[PDB]
Amino acid sequence: NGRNVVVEPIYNPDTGEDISTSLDFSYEPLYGIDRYINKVLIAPDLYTSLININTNYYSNEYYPEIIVLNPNTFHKKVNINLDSSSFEYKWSTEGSDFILVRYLEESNKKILQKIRIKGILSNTQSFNKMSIDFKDIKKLSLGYIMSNFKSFNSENELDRDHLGFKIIDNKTYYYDEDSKLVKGLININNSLFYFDPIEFNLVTGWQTINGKKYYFDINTGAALISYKIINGKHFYFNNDGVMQLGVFKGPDGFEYFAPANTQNN
């Protein structure tokens, strides 16, 4: 389905037993595998009037946006309970859904937690059903949030659905199958490519990944493999693309590829 997490209430085995009316989400089980997950789709049920979203788990690196589906419960008001303060939120609107953004700066690390409530502006029944609880204030409304909180333009988000190389700016991306925007060191057809893991764009030139040295072509972006001439010097890589220090054979003959701080430095 596109590597999307579907949070769902547990189906009750006993029919006569009382049905639970709460949903909880936390970023804790996404630790380590958040670099593969596209989005999170919380899907409430008929018996759901309370949603807790624990947004304080700060040890992750990538935070997927949360899309809250529109419920059709018999309850008068359904409750969203975020454990965060009333400030550091900017609201928006992309068509007919409500966008909430948590942007906070800490430890010289940027955290952008985005929450979207899908299909909530279509009619006043869905508009007046939601009531959002924070850490410092509680029992709000979407009209209160629109009147009080600061608004930002979310229409600048150019990264829509694509399928191949997009040169949408001076930068360039990949946009793989199911439009996931891959962000690491990946191979696509037969050659290794590198996309910078904090801005998602393709980077060229010299690169270092966990100490090892790779080289990526300026014209294309693929990892160089054979004995290649770079700026009048000579370098040798293996099939994996990493340079090797030692004695290896080129077309002109064997050569010596020394480490740094040597007789020639």
Binding site: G2, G16, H75, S96
Partner: protein
Amino acid sequence: ISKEELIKLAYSIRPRENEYKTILTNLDEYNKLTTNNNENKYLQLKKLNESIDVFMNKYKTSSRNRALSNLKKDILKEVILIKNSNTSPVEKNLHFVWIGGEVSDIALEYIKQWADINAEYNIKLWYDSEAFLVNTLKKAIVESSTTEALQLLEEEIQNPQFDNMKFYKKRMEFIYDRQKRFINYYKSQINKPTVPTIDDIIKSHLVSEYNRDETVLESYRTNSLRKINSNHGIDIRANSLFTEQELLNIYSQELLNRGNLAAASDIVRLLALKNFGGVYLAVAMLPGIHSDLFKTISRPSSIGLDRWEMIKLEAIMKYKKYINNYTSENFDKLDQQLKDNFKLIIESKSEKSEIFSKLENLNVSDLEIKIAFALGSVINQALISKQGSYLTNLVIEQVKNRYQFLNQHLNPAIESDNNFTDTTKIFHDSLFNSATAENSMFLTKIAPYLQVGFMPEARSTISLSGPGAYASAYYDFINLQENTIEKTLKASDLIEFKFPENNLSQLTEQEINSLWSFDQASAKYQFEKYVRDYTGGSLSEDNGVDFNKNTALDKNYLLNNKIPSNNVEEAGSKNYVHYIIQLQGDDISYEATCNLFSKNPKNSIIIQRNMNESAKSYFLSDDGESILELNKYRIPERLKNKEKVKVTFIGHGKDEFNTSEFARLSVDSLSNEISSFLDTIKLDISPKNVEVNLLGANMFSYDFNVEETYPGKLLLSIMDKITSTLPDVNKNSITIGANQYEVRINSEGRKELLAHSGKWINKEEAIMSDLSSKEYIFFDSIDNKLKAKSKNIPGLASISEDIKTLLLDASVSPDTKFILNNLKLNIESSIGDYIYYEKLEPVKNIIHNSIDDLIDEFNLLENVSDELYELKKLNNLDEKYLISFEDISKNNSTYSVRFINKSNGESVYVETEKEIFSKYSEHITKEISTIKNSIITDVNGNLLDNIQLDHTSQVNTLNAAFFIQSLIDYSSNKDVLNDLSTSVKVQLYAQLFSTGLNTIYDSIQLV
């Protein structure tokens, strides 16, 4: 409908509760109380719904709430089933309202046409005998207040940068003072033992406070009475319409306190339809036209549907006229064979016998009323009701509730005798301190109630007694509630309550003339007319240096003085090019083009069409500080990949409401200009969506009728050119748009405006009104008329926040504080209207489409479950029967489906002519064959799965697994009777393991 099937369908571990027993007893009373009378049955169903609501509110985690919600949905079907029972025609009457003045000759011709076509229908015209001079009194008050305010503002008239809203505020203050004096004089003549009349009090006030003549006003009262009494007039005071003192007070405060004749006419409509059952039509309505007599004429694609309908009416009433001044300017367009075809096809028939339809059968229920439609919303034009109609009582109860709320929150400000500003501040402080979460939009709408009809952008009757009250009462009737204030209505329920189109036929020249509202452009042109009438020497502000000034592009001034001083920025995407075009040789458009180039110094080009030979494209290079004089209006290679184009024409427009010219061009001339410009674009850009702007003075955006406006016909011609010539741009990827002023931020941070004098003026309320009133009009994809785009809601919120900060500022005059408060109320009402009217589109991507696909699959699953349940009810098959889906062998007409018992396995056959259980069986066979080839082999009951690492082979198996798993696992509605879960489980087991269920026929192995 389940008298005894509700039990053993909703089981809980706890025993039966008192509210559940009340629900069961009330349901049994409903089922055992069956009669042809519908009102008692409706009240019984409403009591049942209220009992279910209070039980589900009391007990939250009960296991019966799912079955009770399904019962609630069955109740919402049953109310439509109850209303569609008494198919009886309405009693034959027509009602028309004209209060306070002479009946116009055009409306007289319309009602005589209605009487001539419908001879068997007894028409009526309602009027007030004591109210005949209120229109003249209101006109005199408006003219006196205009003179009083304009004598005070005469020293500021001479400023060309004058703002109109302060003059309108002063005129509204004087109007409120005169109305307070008149109502004090009217309430001063109640304590006398003798009784006066309303027209006598109005005449006395007119001859005391004006130079009015008693004999002239007596003559005007007398001649107006005989015209109405000859033209089927019946008095509203002679009949027993006015019964309740609350409704008398409502009519008195909406006639004498406020000169609001349409609001008085609304309660007149409801009281007339409550007393005498009849069919109401407005005085600007025409009878319907048969579609068969005009279907031989093909409609052109360059003419909208409303334009085609009104030129059809103009073609009918052009030759056989029946109207003294029926304008046919839109009919007089160039179509010679269409005009000749219309002439022969209306001269080949008889006179008023087949051209216009008849009202010979209007079959409605006692509870039902029908109402006209206008752009997806109801409108109080055509009504059909019997005598004593229940939903008509609901509408008048909603009007009573809204007026009671308004009077309760207004009467402190009425009794507090102050001036207009303090009175409306007391009113606003009383309203906003009682604003809950359910009527915030309602209070924001009815907040500028005292200035309705006098100040621009003041619409309160729509929420008080008009289409908002009608839609609220429709919701209240359908969903079985009491006194809903403001909630939405489904389009399906609205078209189920829809008036017939061939009986309504709304489109009328008088209807189009009345469709315009008192907006910003109307207020500006009325102010200009007032100044031009009061002062003999009018001021010509359009002359300037406008002509004979072929100013070249100052490259040094553009590069060194404007782009480094660009203090503004945008937060939108940059995959577009800005084709900035200058159409006039003046410093105003030169500075406007320079400022737009400051807005976009990267992608924009400059084309000056004030001269012809020295016309090219100016833009920055790949490096900064370099401007190219490239000819042929071309673009660099960096701009050859953008998917959007944003053309912009900057010029002037003459002072005319709905101006037909821009920059001394016309619609067709500018369409040919854009076509000739597009002949050079086609070799560079193959875009996905286009966008046309229009900047310049006296260029506004209108929201009621987008046709007959300047962007409408231009939009139609340009969309024809786009869908003919430019590839990969769809019909719905079109956008027209008009803007009046120019926005610039200086080094301080303030927003600056450019006027005709060439200097920069901080007209903050004008620039905020322009930014909040700019719209975009596009062509909708359902093959309909032109629609308006949704505005930038965060942009409106930013404008409202800036208004809030400027109102919290200290050095701001109270008049501008009042104007900005009104603008904030208008912006909040606009956002509430976008929420309320369902004008916000859903988003479309890969993530959002799958959610809607599962929603549609669940709805289809519920429909199949309900139809299977009623089939099992009809054919008297018990719970032990399992339907087969692989055997949908059919006859020529009916569909035959077989059943398998779970105890002895016989194969009976039943016949039912339904398209469902054939395509659904095909779907559940295809989604089982999708996973059938995902299994390589079966070894001793263990299935060896085959995994596919291709992405497109993983979506199909996952979708099939979801589709099978949902309808094999989910407990559907009324699933204790029919077991569709095991009915598809047996089919899945048979197809996965053995030979299929269509082949297995032996009873023992079937069991």
